[PDB]
Scaffold this motif. Sequence first.
Motif, PDB file in Angstrom:
ATOM      1  N   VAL A 198       0.854  -1.188   0.000  1.00  0.00           N
ATOM      2  CA  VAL A 198       0.000   0.000   0.000  1.00  0.00           C
ATOM      3  C   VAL A 198       0.889   1.237   0.000  1.00  0.00           C
ATOM      4  O   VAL A 198       1.783   1.334   0.836  1.00  0.00           O
ATOM      5  CB  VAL A 198      -0.968   0.004   1.206  1.00  0.00           C
ATOM      6  N   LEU A 233      -3.166   8.226   2.935  1.00  0.00           N
ATOM      7  CA  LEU A 233      -3.587   7.436   4.099  1.00  0.00           C
ATOM      8  C   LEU A 233      -2.404   7.567   5.057  1.00  0.00           C
ATOM      9  O   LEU A 233      -1.546   6.688   5.104  1.00  0.00           O
ATOM     10  CB  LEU A 233      -3.782   5.953   3.725  1.00  0.00           C
ATOM     11  N   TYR A 250      -2.131   4.784   7.849  1.00  0.00           N
ATOM     12  CA  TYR A 250      -2.031   3.380   7.453  1.00  0.00           C
ATOM     13  C   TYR A 250      -0.923   2.633   8.162  1.00  0.00           C
ATOM     14  O   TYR A 250      -1.186   1.589   8.750  1.00  0.00           O
ATOM     15  CB  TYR A 250      -1.890   3.201   5.920  1.00  0.00           C
ATOM     16  N   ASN A 269      -9.771  -0.756   6.712  1.00  0.00           N
ATOM     17  CA  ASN A 269     -10.931  -0.219   6.010  1.00  0.00           C
ATOM     18  C   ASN A 269     -12.268  -0.529   6.675  1.00  0.00           C
ATOM     19  O   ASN A 269     -12.333  -1.360   7.583  1.00  0.00           O
ATOM     20  CB  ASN A 269     -10.894  -0.688   4.550  1.00  0.00           C
TER      21      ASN A 269
HETATM   22  C1  LIG Z   1      -9.936   4.018   4.142  1.00  0.00           C
HETATM   23  C2  LIG Z   1      -9.223   4.425   2.871  1.00  0.00           C
HETATM   24  N1  LIG Z   1      -8.500   3.336   2.273  1.00  0.00           N
HETATM   25  C3  LIG Z   1      -8.184   3.376   0.934  1.00  0.00           C
HETATM   26  O1  LIG Z   1      -8.488   4.310   0.203  1.00  0.00           O
HETATM   27  C4  LIG Z   1      -7.455   2.217   0.496  1.00  0.00           C
HETATM   28  C5  LIG Z   1      -6.806   2.004  -0.704  1.00  0.00           C
HETATM   29  C6  LIG Z   1      -6.227   0.710  -0.638  1.00  0.00           C
HETATM   30  C7  LIG Z   1      -5.440  -0.030  -1.560  1.00  0.00           C
HETATM   31  C8  LIG Z   1      -4.942   0.441  -2.864  1.00  0.00           C
HETATM   32  C9  LIG Z   1      -3.585   0.482  -3.101  1.00  0.00           C
HETATM   33  C10 LIG Z   1      -3.086   0.949  -4.299  1.00  0.00           C
HETATM   34  S1  LIG Z   1      -1.305   0.973  -4.512  1.00  0.00           S
HETATM   35  C11 LIG Z   1      -0.921  -0.697  -4.087  1.00  0.00           C
HETATM   36  O2  LIG Z   1      -1.067   1.179  -5.924  1.00  0.00           O
HETATM   37  O3  LIG Z   1      -0.673   1.788  -3.490  1.00  0.00           O
HETATM   38  C12 LIG Z   1      -3.934   1.372  -5.299  1.00  0.00           C
HETATM   39  C13 LIG Z   1      -5.295   1.330  -5.065  1.00  0.00           C
HETATM   40  C14 LIG Z   1      -5.786   0.878  -3.857  1.00  0.00           C
HETATM   41  O4  LIG Z   1      -7.130   0.795  -3.550  1.00  0.00           O
HETATM   42  C15 LIG Z   1      -8.028   1.436  -4.359  1.00  0.00           C
HETATM   43  C16 LIG Z   1      -8.188   2.806  -4.277  1.00  0.00           C
HETATM   44  C17 LIG Z   1      -9.140   3.393  -5.084  1.00  0.00           C
HETATM   45  C18 LIG Z   1      -9.901   2.614  -5.938  1.00  0.00           C
HETATM   46  F1  LIG Z   1     -10.817   3.178  -6.748  1.00  0.00           F
HETATM   47  C19 LIG Z   1      -9.753   1.247  -5.993  1.00  0.00           C
HETATM   48  C20 LIG Z   1      -8.819   0.660  -5.179  1.00  0.00           C
HETATM   49  F2  LIG Z   1      -8.667  -0.668  -5.250  1.00  0.00           F
HETATM   50  C21 LIG Z   1      -5.054  -1.257  -1.180  1.00  0.00           C
HETATM   51  N2  LIG Z   1      -5.388  -1.810   0.043  1.00  0.00           N
HETATM   52  C22 LIG Z   1      -4.902  -3.127   0.324  1.00  0.00           C
HETATM   53  C23 LIG Z   1      -6.108  -1.134   1.024  1.00  0.00           C
HETATM   54  O5  LIG Z   1      -6.386  -1.585   2.127  1.00  0.00           O
HETATM   55  C24 LIG Z   1      -6.516   0.162   0.585  1.00  0.00           C
HETATM   56  N3  LIG Z   1      -7.262   1.087   1.253  1.00  0.00           N
END
Ligand SMILES: CCNC(=O)c1cc2c(-c3cc(S(C)(=O)=O)ccc3Oc3ccc(F)cc3F)cn(C)c(=O)c2[nH]1
Length: 106
Positions: free
Chosen positions: A28, A35, A38, A81
Amino acid sequence: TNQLQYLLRVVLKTLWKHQFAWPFQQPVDAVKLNLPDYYKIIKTPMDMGTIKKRLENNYYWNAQECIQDFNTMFTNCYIYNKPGDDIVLMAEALEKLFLQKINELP
Ligand SMILES: CCNC(=O)c1cc2c(-c3cc(S(C)(=O)=O)ccc3Oc3ccc(F)cc3F)cn(C)c(=O)c2[nH]1
Protein backbone atom coordinates in the motif's frame (compact mmCIF):
# COMPACT_ATOMS: atom_id res chain seq x y z
CA THR A 1 7.66 -29.82 -0.63
CA ASN A 2 5.85 -29.49 -3.22
CA GLN A 3 3.17 -27.62 -1.23
CA LEU A 4 5.27 -24.42 -1.76
CA GLN A 5 5.28 -25.26 -5.53
CA TYR A 6 1.47 -25.44 -5.48
CA LEU A 7 1.30 -22.05 -3.73
CA LEU A 8 3.45 -20.47 -6.44
CA ARG A 9 2.20 -22.28 -9.60
CA VAL A 10 -1.47 -22.62 -8.66
CA VAL A 11 -2.66 -20.38 -5.75
CA LEU A 12 -0.61 -17.20 -6.45
CA LYS A 13 -1.03 -17.55 -10.23
CA THR A 14 -4.85 -17.81 -9.89
CA LEU A 15 -5.15 -14.88 -7.48
CA TRP A 16 -2.69 -12.70 -9.45
CA LYS A 17 -4.63 -12.93 -12.75
CA HIS A 18 -7.96 -12.04 -11.04
CA GLN A 19 -9.77 -8.79 -11.89
CA PHE A 20 -9.50 -7.50 -8.27
CA ALA A 21 -5.82 -8.42 -7.71
CA TRP A 22 -4.15 -5.21 -8.91
CA PRO A 23 -4.50 -3.16 -5.57
CA PHE A 24 -2.81 -6.11 -3.75
CA GLN A 25 0.12 -6.73 -6.19
CA GLN A 26 2.44 -4.26 -4.41
CA PRO A 27 2.61 -2.70 -0.88
CA VAL A 28 0.00 0.00 0.00
CA ASP A 29 1.51 3.37 -1.02
CA ALA A 30 0.23 5.54 1.81
CA VAL A 31 1.75 8.79 0.39
CA LYS A 32 0.21 8.33 -3.09
CA LEU A 33 -3.18 7.32 -1.61
CA ASN A 34 -3.24 9.96 1.19
CA LEU A 35 -3.59 7.44 4.10
CA PRO A 36 -1.07 8.92 6.61
CA ASP A 37 -2.31 6.68 9.47
CA TYR A 38 -2.03 3.38 7.45
CA TYR A 39 1.44 2.48 8.71
CA LYS A 40 0.57 3.54 12.31
CA ILE A 41 -2.41 1.09 12.41
CA ILE A 42 -0.95 -1.74 10.17
CA LYS A 43 2.28 -3.05 11.72
CA THR A 44 2.72 -6.09 9.46
CA PRO A 45 1.96 -4.89 5.89
CA MET A 46 1.56 -7.68 3.33
CA ASP A 47 0.81 -7.96 -0.40
CA MET A 48 1.04 -10.49 -3.26
CA GLY A 49 4.16 -8.83 -4.68
CA THR A 50 6.03 -9.55 -1.41
CA ILE A 51 4.55 -13.12 -1.23
CA LYS A 52 5.67 -13.75 -4.86
CA LYS A 53 9.21 -12.51 -4.07
CA ARG A 54 9.32 -14.72 -0.91
CA LEU A 55 8.21 -17.82 -2.91
CA GLU A 56 10.82 -17.09 -5.62
CA ASN A 57 13.69 -16.38 -3.23
CA ASN A 58 13.36 -19.30 -0.73
CA TYR A 59 12.15 -17.10 2.20
CA TYR A 60 9.54 -19.44 3.67
CA TRP A 61 10.26 -22.09 6.34
CA ASN A 62 7.24 -23.99 4.85
CA ALA A 63 3.81 -23.51 3.08
CA GLN A 64 2.05 -22.63 6.36
CA GLU A 65 4.21 -19.52 6.70
CA CYS A 66 3.13 -18.50 3.15
CA ILE A 67 -0.58 -19.14 3.99
CA GLN A 68 -0.09 -16.88 7.11
CA ASP A 69 1.16 -14.06 4.77
CA PHE A 70 -1.96 -14.38 2.52
CA ASN A 71 -4.19 -14.20 5.64
CA THR A 72 -2.28 -11.18 7.01
CA MET A 73 -2.85 -9.42 3.65
CA PHE A 74 -6.65 -10.03 3.89
CA THR A 75 -7.06 -9.11 7.58
CA ASN A 76 -4.87 -5.97 7.23
CA CYS A 77 -7.54 -4.84 4.69
CA TYR A 78 -10.39 -5.65 7.13
CA ILE A 79 -8.56 -3.87 10.02
CA TYR A 80 -7.77 -0.60 8.14
CA ASN A 81 -10.93 -0.22 6.01
CA LYS A 82 -14.68 -0.06 6.80
CA PRO A 83 -16.97 -3.01 5.96
CA GLY A 84 -18.74 -2.52 2.65
CA ASP A 85 -15.84 -0.48 1.12
CA ASP A 86 -14.87 -1.47 -2.46
CA ILE A 87 -11.33 -2.56 -1.38
CA VAL A 88 -12.95 -4.79 1.31
CA LEU A 89 -15.26 -6.43 -1.28
CA MET A 90 -12.24 -6.98 -3.58
CA ALA A 91 -10.28 -8.60 -0.67
CA GLU A 92 -13.34 -10.74 0.21
CA ALA A 93 -13.59 -12.08 -3.35
CA LEU A 94 -9.85 -12.87 -3.39
CA GLU A 95 -10.10 -14.57 0.02
CA LYS A 96 -12.98 -16.78 -1.13
CA LEU A 97 -10.99 -17.86 -4.20
CA PHE A 98 -7.84 -18.37 -2.03
CA LEU A 99 -9.80 -20.67 0.40
CA GLN A 100 -11.04 -22.74 -2.56
CA LYS A 101 -7.50 -23.28 -3.99
CA ILE A 102 -6.00 -23.90 -0.51
CA ASN A 103 -8.63 -26.61 0.16
CA GLU A 104 -6.98 -28.70 -2.67
CA LEU A 105 -3.43 -28.18 -1.23
CA PRO A 106 -1.35 -31.41 -1.45
C1 LIG B 1 -9.94 4.02 4.14
C2 LIG B 1 -9.22 4.42 2.87
N1 LIG B 1 -8.50 3.34 2.27
C3 LIG B 1 -8.18 3.38 0.93
O1 LIG B 1 -8.49 4.31 0.20
C4 LIG B 1 -7.45 2.22 0.50
C5 LIG B 1 -6.81 2.00 -0.70
C6 LIG B 1 -6.23 0.71 -0.64
C7 LIG B 1 -5.44 -0.03 -1.56
C8 LIG B 1 -4.94 0.44 -2.86
C9 LIG B 1 -3.58 0.48 -3.10
C10 LIG B 1 -3.09 0.95 -4.30
S1 LIG B 1 -1.30 0.97 -4.51
C11 LIG B 1 -0.92 -0.70 -4.09
O2 LIG B 1 -1.07 1.18 -5.92
O3 LIG B 1 -0.67 1.79 -3.49
C12 LIG B 1 -3.93 1.37 -5.30
C13 LIG B 1 -5.30 1.33 -5.06
C14 LIG B 1 -5.79 0.88 -3.86
O4 LIG B 1 -7.13 0.80 -3.55
C15 LIG B 1 -8.03 1.44 -4.36
C16 LIG B 1 -8.19 2.81 -4.28
C17 LIG B 1 -9.14 3.39 -5.08
C18 LIG B 1 -9.90 2.61 -5.94
F1 LIG B 1 -10.82 3.18 -6.75
C19 LIG B 1 -9.75 1.25 -5.99
C20 LIG B 1 -8.82 0.66 -5.18
F2 LIG B 1 -8.67 -0.67 -5.25
C21 LIG B 1 -5.05 -1.26 -1.18
N2 LIG B 1 -5.39 -1.81 0.04
C22 LIG B 1 -4.90 -3.13 0.32
C23 LIG B 1 -6.11 -1.13 1.02
O5 LIG B 1 -6.39 -1.59 2.13
C24 LIG B 1 -6.52 0.16 0.58
N3 LIG B 1 -7.26 1.09 1.25
